[PDB]
Amino acid sequence: TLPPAWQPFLKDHRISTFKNWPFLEGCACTPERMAEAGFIHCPTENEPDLAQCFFCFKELEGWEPDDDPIEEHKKHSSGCAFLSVKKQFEELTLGEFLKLDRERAKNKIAKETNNKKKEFEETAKKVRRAIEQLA
């Protein structure tokens, strides 16, 4: 086996996430290339093509067949330490591995923060709007 929270570091686990991914043979954003890129497929009905970096948590939709998932990665999240990782997983040192996994747990915290802040501004807008309607 292998601890379940470390799976996303494994290319094959990532590939495995692509359920009804539409871009297959002939396309440049195949499940395979996506996984190589660090993406995991996390589809909702509202956006069935939603892919997310397991490391930086940056979320990307509106995929088109010619999209090279790696360039899209560099483009929409230039600072993702995964991109820098040039070794295969098992060539990584455990120290290196734990460094990476540390940054990822922090990226995760940043992300939740950024979310909470967005939810906060959202509810504020509602409040301000309701208040104007009252004023």
Add this chain to the structure above:
Amino acid sequence: TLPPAWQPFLKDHRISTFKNWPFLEGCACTPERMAEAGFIHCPTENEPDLAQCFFCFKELEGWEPDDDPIEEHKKHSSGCAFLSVKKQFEELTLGEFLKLDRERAKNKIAKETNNKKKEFEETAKKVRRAIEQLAA
């Protein structure tokens, strides 16, 4: 955070495993030198000096203060892969590590089935004896 099952690979975790370990500083078989040798303290009310190699599962009590845990390990389980491991943990490669962790799970089963076997034979002896007594 290191998943709980991989802890024993960590020297520190192994030391921390030692509670009320009688031998100590001034003694060759310190907790520190035990961990380094791969042992955990699995003390039983019987003998709170029960130690086990986390890797080959070889078990040893009745420790002597001048016993060199590494020497005692090699002698008892000559073919324990841990003994070959010369790099620090974080120095290990994910491959290297994965290879070691399979090795260990393998040793674990070999240990357990070895128990099953011996237990079975003992049951087999009691049954045969009882059938024999019935012949008489």
Add this chain to the structure above:
Amino acid sequence: ARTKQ
């Protein structure tokens, strides 16, 4: 591809 919603 583009940043989410």
Add this chain to the structure above:
Amino acid sequence: ARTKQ
């Protein structure tokens, strides 16, 4: 030392 039991 010695192997258990």
